[PDB]
Write a protein that binds this ligand. Structure first.
Ligand SMILES: O=C(N[C@@H]1C[C@H](C(=O)NCc2ccc(C#Cc3ccc(CN4CCOCC4)cc3)cc2)N(C(=O)C2CC2)C1)[C@@H]1C[C@H](F)CN1
Ligand SMILES: [Zn+2]
Length: 297
């Protein structure tokens, strides 16, 4: 059968929080069967643990954020992206501060570390949510859609009215396209104008070229430019995938985002969980017949 994966070994990384400018020490520990992904504030006494279920999501404005009480964990999307990518079911994610470190602006550093350590299969069937019906949300000109699909695939359009905006639509089937190779390296991005305002509202305090695509009026200001033709929309997919990990079970279906953010992605989540008609849980007693598949541990 398809079995749950956890970490083989623990991983320590160090970085800054993009919004906080805070030095943050990160530790990824294996977790038991049926733990799911569980974020943890080790700097607090006692320690505060927020499962990365959708129920725990807060201010979605500048990043995806987990809350319990008046304790938050900011910017989980890139890491959850990475964990989703490699099909990790169970991990604890320890932090010395409120924000998850940004590293380079992509999932790549996270995927690296996860795979250097390696994965452990566990005597327990992986549980899957199969999309069974179109489920759609709109707000103004944004839209966000699940569509049943025998596999896992993500599509995104964006429109920025911008000299730099190269391609603004992409679609990836992850049962025939390497998440690792095609999506994981896609960096977050800010606009020159936004940044000037946000710094003077104590946001983007840890932001630099070393972890973000910086865009002028006209051009990427990053000396070494883009990792991809379509990095921006490739990053949007990355983020989308993270948000979808909050289900707390992997997805057999397709997502389509149009101009969508964390806020509308999270609405889509809630609505989907609410319409029990629209989905079902499935395990597979024979991976050679299952519609999505996995990399070697
Ligand atoms: O990636 C995400 N969203 C995407 C990207 C983008 C967005 O929300 N971006 C959010 C974002 C905002 C600001 C920065 C920065 C910086 C910065 C760079 C240089 C200096 C000065 N330097 C410092 C060093 O010295 C030299 C100068 C100072 C600061 C990076 C990302 N977006 C948008 O739609 C944008 C348009 C609204 C969709 C989510 C959200 C979080 F960003 C993380 N994941
Ligand atoms: Zn992002």
């Amino acid at each position: 059968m398809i079995k749950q994966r956890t970490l083989k070994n623990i991983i320590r990384a160090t970085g800054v929080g993009l919004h906080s400018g805070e030095k943050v020490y990160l530790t990824l520990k294996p977790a038991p069967v049926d733990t799911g992904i569980v974020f943890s504030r080790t700097d607090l006494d006692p320690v505060v643990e927020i499962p990365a279920r959708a129920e725990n999501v807060g201010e979605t404005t500048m990043s995806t954020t987990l809350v319990k009480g008046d304790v938050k964990v900011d910017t989980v999307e890139h890491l959850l992206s990475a964990m989703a990518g490699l099909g990790i079911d169970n991990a604890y994610v320890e932090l010395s501060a409120s924000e998850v470190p940004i590293m380079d602006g992509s999932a790549g550093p996270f995927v690296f570390l996860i795979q250097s350590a390696g994965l452990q299969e566990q005597e327990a069937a992986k549980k899957f949510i199969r999309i069974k019906r179109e489920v759609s949300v709109e707000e103004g000109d944004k839209r966000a859609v699940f569509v049943p699909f025998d596999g896992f695939k993500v599509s995104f359009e964006i429109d920025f009215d911008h000299p730099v905006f190269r391609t603004q639509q992409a679609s990836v089937d992850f049962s025939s396209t390497s998440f690792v190779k095609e999506v994981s390296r896609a960096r977050t991005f800010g606009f020159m104008r936004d940044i000037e305002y946000l710094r003077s509202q104590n946001l983007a305090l840890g932001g630099s070229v070393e972890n973000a695509i910086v865009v002028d009026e006209n051009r990427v200001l990053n000396e070494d430019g883009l990792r991809y033709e379509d990095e921006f929309v490739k990053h949007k997919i990355l983020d989308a995938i993270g948000d979808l990990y909050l289900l707390g079970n992997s997805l057999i279906g397709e997502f389509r985002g149009f101009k969508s953010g964390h806020a509308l992605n999270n609405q889509l989540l809630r609505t989907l969980i609410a319409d029990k008609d629209a989905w079902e849980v499935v395990t597979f007693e024979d991976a050679r017949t299952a519609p999505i598949s996995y990399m070697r541990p």
